[PDB]
Copies of this chain bind each other. A is one copy, B any other.
Amino acid sequence: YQLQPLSLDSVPWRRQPGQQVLWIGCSDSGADELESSGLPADEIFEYRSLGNMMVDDLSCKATLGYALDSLKIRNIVICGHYGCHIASGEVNAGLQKPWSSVLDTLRSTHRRTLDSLTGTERDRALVELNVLEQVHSLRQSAEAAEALQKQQLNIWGMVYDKATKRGYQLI
């Protein structure tokens, strides 16, 4: 994967005005992430959750179902963010399963990548890896797979950097 700086005026989830985009972000983003979306506020249908994850739960399934079935959304963005306290470090006791299992699996699957980095750079890699795995996982969902095979859905990953005040697409 590579990180491509977004140009606000040419984001792949806004090829035309006036549509809604399902924006999946993290509860501790704590800054101006939507100012890097390339979308006006009225085009954003926002689901903001622990770790910008979609897990096997009623909320994640109903939100996706409402977006595709009621709003006819054709674009989903999973936005992670540098400095995340949830997709960080090696443990957090107050984070329940399956969120904690997703991060355990990231850390074990990508151990050699993570072990090659230190401290803040490692946490930045874990943010990026979480976005990539959430995008891949969401495409394998039955509801997304059907819409993808009909060419009625795209799922995009990006990471927001509150220090550079920019978003970066995962390509």
Q: Which residues of A contact B (CB under 8 A)?
A: 27-32, 41-50, 55, 57-63, 65-66, 68-71, 86, 92-96, 98-99
Contacts and interface: CB of A to CB of B under 8 A. Distances in A.
A59 B106 CA distance: 20
Contacts of A50: 59, 62-63, 66
Nearest to A162: B41
A162 B139 CA distance: 34
B58 A27 contact: no
Nearest to A72: B94
16 contacts: A28-B45, A30-B43, A30-B44, A46-B48, A49-B59, A50-B59, A50-B63, A57-B57, A57-B59, A58-B59, A59-B60, A62-B95, A62-B96, A66-B94, A66-B95, A66-B96
A169 B68 CA distance: 33
Given A49-B63, A69-B93, 10 more contacts: A30-B41, A30-B42, A48-B48, A50-B63, A55-B58, A55-B59, A57-B58, A62-B95, A66-B86, A70-B94
A58 B45 CA distance: 21
A45 B30 CA distance: 7
Contacts of A41: 30-32
A67 to B, nearest CB: 8
Contacts of A29: 46
Nearest to A58: B57
Contacts of A68: 94
A60 B93 CA distance: 17
